[PDB]
Amino acid sequence: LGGPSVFLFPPKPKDTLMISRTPEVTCVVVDVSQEDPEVQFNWYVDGVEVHNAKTKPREEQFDSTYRVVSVLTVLHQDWLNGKEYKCKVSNKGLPSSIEKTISKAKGQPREPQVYTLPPSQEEMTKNQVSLTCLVKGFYPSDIAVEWESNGQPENNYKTTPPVLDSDGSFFLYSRLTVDKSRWQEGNVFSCSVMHEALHNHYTQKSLSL
Amino acid sequence: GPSVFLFPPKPKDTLMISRTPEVTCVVVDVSQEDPEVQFNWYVDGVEVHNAKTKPREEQFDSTYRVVSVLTVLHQDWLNGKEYKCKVSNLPSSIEKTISKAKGQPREPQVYTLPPSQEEMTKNQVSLTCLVKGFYPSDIAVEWESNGQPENNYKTTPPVLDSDGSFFLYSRLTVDKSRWQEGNVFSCSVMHEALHNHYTQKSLSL
């Protein structure tokens, strides 16, 4: 039937694991009619209502409909404790109030094993080589992977999405492309992995020649 | 009303001449009061007739599902020929059209990586096969050992790189004793940009 639609998005995994960042649960409604644009939000954390949400003004889409977004800042420890977050939306374009609920992935968390793999000797003929970081056996799939060397971050890398393995855990690979000289000259490269099952939600493994 | 989906042939079917690739046209949500459906297939605008149509299977939904399958020529799909499917269930027909991804093929580099020494403390180890610098993303990866096929592996999806090419990883899990006894493992990769559409890289202790 006709009327607006309500979506509720979880925080970025990286925002959850780092305390220097800010994890957010976002409730966004679309297809809000111009004839009835006024939208009210109501947030609940495990049934208890919170009021610290920040609602952005109605943005008019291309087709005269409106998009309204309400964003709620959550606590790192709260989200990881599995606390449920509810978003209730009230609008005249809807026959009734609609509630959506989101929470952390359920299931026993498993610590990721991190292994660094040196380049293949065959790839040593090309100008740049591939440093590989294998992260496996972790649960849930929310994870973050970065690269560092000499303190400064190396930003020339890509990371495959989490893949479900036979034992119900995930695995992925991260590939950092470096100039051969920097690898031949014996520099130390560190694969950084962040995950809720790790000690202090962080670990790193070095890789050199 | 009913809706139509069109699916490409499996990447492995298009590369190995032994297998036969097929495009599949699916029609769902067919009302019980109107199950009569006709299909029309077109190759680069030219209509073909060598397609086989499965019977109307009923769903729990009290609606029906009709599936049409067209056999395609291996070289046709590799050249970018367009396959269109027209469905009529009444002057209101729905068209769907699909072909191979546009662009110049780039052959993949295959590198076999041994398990990290830190993993030797576990009962099973990981054999890593890196496939990079290929286009398009259509690719297939398998594992063999002493001729016999290995099945305990998992392959990541193709990941788009910076130079407009793709890369992926494939990870085979074997018992540590298998690896320690110097058994030979090989990573096989089938891609259109490879000579004979096939290459293999060995890996052992």
Numbering used by the authors:
A (entry chain D): 235 to 443
B (entry chain C): 237 to 325, 328 to 443
Authors' account:
IgG antibodies are responsible for antibody-dependent cell-mediated cytotoxicity, antibody-dependent cellular phagocytosis and complement activation, functions mediated through binding of the Fc region to Fcγ receptors and C1q, respectively. The Fc region comprises a dimer of CH2 and CH3 domains that are linked to the two Fab fragments through the hinge region, and an oligosaccharide moiety covalently attached to the CH2 domain at position 297. The oligosaccharide not only orients the CH2 domains but affects Fcγ receptor binding and complement activation, and therefore plays an important role in influencing IgG effector function. In IgG1, the FG loop conformation is conserved, but in IgG4 it adopts a different, unique conformation, consistent with the anti-inflammatory properties of this subclass.
We now report the crystal structure of enzymatically deglycosylated, serum-derived human IgG4-Fc (degly-Fc)*, solved at 2.7 Å resolution. The asymmetric unit of the deglycosylated IgG4-Fc (degly-Fc)* structure contains two interlocked Fc molecules related to one another by a pseudo-symmetric two-fold rotation. The deglycosylated IgG4-Fc structure that we report here also adopts an open CH2 domain conformation, dictated by the interlocked nature of the Fc molecules in the asymmetric unit, with a Pro329-Pro329 Cα distance of 29.1 Å. The patch exposed by the absence of carbohydrate in the degly-Fc structure is partially covered by the intermolecular CH2-CH2 domain interface, burying a total surface area of ∼750 Å2. Asn297 is deamidated to Asp through the action of PNGase F, and in chains A, C and D, the Asp297 side chain adopts different rotamer positions compared with Asn297 in glycosylated IgG-Fc. However, in degly-Fc, Phe296 faces towards the inner face of the CH2 domain in a manner that would not be possible in fucosylated IgG4-Fc due to steric clashes. In contrast, the CH2 FG loop in chains A, B and D of the degly-Fc structure adopts a conformation which is similar to that found in IgG1, and folds back on to the CH2 domain. On the other hand, in chain C of the degly-Fc structure, although residues Lys326, Gly327 and the side chain of Leu328 are disordered, the positions of residues Pro329 and Ser330 are more akin to those of the unique IgG4 FG loop conformation. The degly-Fc crystals belong to a hitherto unreported space group for IgG-Fc (P622), although the same space group was reported for intact IgG4 crystals, and the six-fold crystallographic axis generates a hexameric, planar assembly of IgG4-Fc molecules, in which chain A from one Fc molecule interacts with chain B from another. Thus, to form the hexamer interface, a structural change occurs in the CH2 AB loop, in which residues Ile253 and Ser254 move away from the CH2 domain.
